[PDB]
Amino acid sequence: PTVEDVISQVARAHREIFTRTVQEIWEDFSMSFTPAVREVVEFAKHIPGFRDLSQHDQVTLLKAGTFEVLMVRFASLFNVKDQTVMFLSRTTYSLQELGAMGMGDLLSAMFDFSEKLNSLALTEEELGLFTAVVLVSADRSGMENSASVEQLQETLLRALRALVLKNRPLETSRFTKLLLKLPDLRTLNNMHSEKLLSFRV
Amino acid sequence: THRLITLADHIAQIITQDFA
Ligand SMILES: Clc1nnc2ccc(Oc3ccccc3-c3ccccc3)nn12
């Protein structure tokens, strides 16, 4: 499809789908986190070209890039000034209150990343198109057909280039600043994807 | 009474369960 078809479709799905004791915090986390992951999978279906990939490649991409998508999606839920993170159930928590989980370092890394992402002032369209780019930009190890994924990545990368130029033409490095978040996201995934979660058994 | 699992494995668990 055309670049304006990609922006319109990806941004529409982005609005439709996305937009105090240790044990109780882990139940609120689990009940917020599980639908959040499902939302990434539903958003992925609505990405022009994603369903055309083989079932294996779709699952491989979602398994590799869902943590990174959640870091971008949850970035706005981190209040850098108040030092408060809100969960998908509208419950707000202090950093200290949340220290009783494993993470600790993941939560402070998230405050820095959201702050960095905030300085860009992405419009909803831009954020939705970046979220799609993040998902298709995951490690392509174990892909039956990496070529199909690379072409899906460049289709979303061209639409993001155009949207960002349409919005802030004078800010010629806006696209660059967005591609520069990719190794930051890759470091956070490499540093924190192995951290442990607790569930009532 | 409590289960422990990495962020990656729990994500992959939700994914493989959703693709049924
Ligand atoms: Cl659940 C849920 N629903 N909304 C929010 C908002 C923030 C939040 O952060 C976390 C808190 C504890 C453990 C992991 C994360 C986390 C997971 C993936 C990517 C980034 C962070 N979890 N959360």
Helix intervals (H) in chain A: 3-17, 22-45, 55-74, 105-118, 124-136, 146-167, 174-179, 181-192
Q: Tokens 């405050």 label which residue? A: A111
B2 membership: H or E segment, kind and range: strand B2-6
Identify whether the C-beta of residue B2 lies closer than 8 Å to the C-beta of residue A200.
yes
Nearest Cβ partner for A34 among B7, B8, B14: B14
Q: Are A91 and A183 in contact, with CB atoms under 8 Å apart?
A: no
Q: Which of A21, A30, A51, A62 to mutate to test the interface with B (most CBs of B within 10 A)?
A: A62
**Residue A130 · residue A72 · CB < 8 Å:** yes
CA atoms of A58 and A81, how far apart (whole Å): 38
B17–chain A Cβ distance below 8 A for any pair:
no
How many CB atoms lie under 10 A from the CB of residue A189? 21
Q: Are the Cβ atoms of A192 and B10 closer than 8 angstroms?
A: no
Contact A129, A160 (CB under 8 A): yes
Cα B13 from Cα A155, distance rounded (Å): 29
Nearest to A7 by CA among A142, A118, A157: A157
Backbone angles phi, psi at A91, to 5 degrees: -85, 125
Range of the domain at A67: 1-201
Residue type, A52: D
Beta bridge partners, B4, equal: A198
Residue A199's DSSP bridge partners are B3
**Residues in contact with A50: Cβ distance below 8 Å, sequence separation at least 6, in sequence order:** A44, A58, A61, A136, A152
Strand partners of residue A94: A84
The Cα A77–Cα A199 span in angstroms is 22
Relative to beta strand A196-200, strand B2-6 is antiparallel
The three-class DSSP label of residue A189 is: helix
Task: For residue A155, report the distance from its CA to the centre of ligand 1, in Å.
Answer: 29
Cβ–Cβ under 8 Å, residues A106 and A151 = no
* Structure tokens given for A124: 């909803």
* Residues of chain B contacting residue A195, judged by C-beta atoms under 8 Å apart: 6-7
Longest dimension (CA), chain B: 28
Q: Please name which of A201, A38, A65, A69 lies closest in space to residue B20, comparing C-alpha atoms.
A: A38
Q: Scan for tokens 């490499």, then name that residue.
A: A190
Which positions in chain B touch A196 (Cβ < 8 Å)? 4-7
Burial A140-160 (b: 16+ CB within 10 A, else e): beebeeeeebeebbebbbebb
d(CA A121, CA A127): 9
Question: Is residue A200 within 8 angstroms of chain B, CB to CB?
Answer: yes
Interface contact A201, partner B, CB < 8 A: yes
∠ Cα A34 A126 A59 (to 5°)? 40
For B1-20, b where at least 16 C-beta lie within 10 A, e where not — what string?
eeeeeebbebbbebbeeeee
8-state DSSP, A101: S
* Contact present, A103 and A26 (Cβ < 8 Å): no
Q: Which two tokens stand for residue A33?
A: 């986190």
Question: Total structural domains in chain A?
Answer: 1
C-alpha neighbours within 13 Å on the C-beta side of residue A14:
22
A143, A149 contact by CB (below 8 A):
yes
> CB-based contact (8 Å) between A62 and chain B?
yes
| C-beta neighbour count of A47 within 10 angstroms | 23
* Method used to determine the 3D structure: X-ray
A35 contact partners, CB below 8 Å, separation of at least 6: A88
**Cα dihedral sign, A53-A58-A60-A62:** positive
Query: Structure tokens of A4?
Result: 């304006």
Pairing relationship of beta strands A84-86 and A92-94 according to DSSP bridges: antiparallel
Site to probe by mutation for ligand 1, drawn from A22, A26, A29 as the one with most ligand atoms within 8 Å of Cβ, is A29
Q: Give contacts of B17 with chain A, Cβ < 8 Å.
A: none
Q: What's the token pair of residue A52?
A: 């055309």
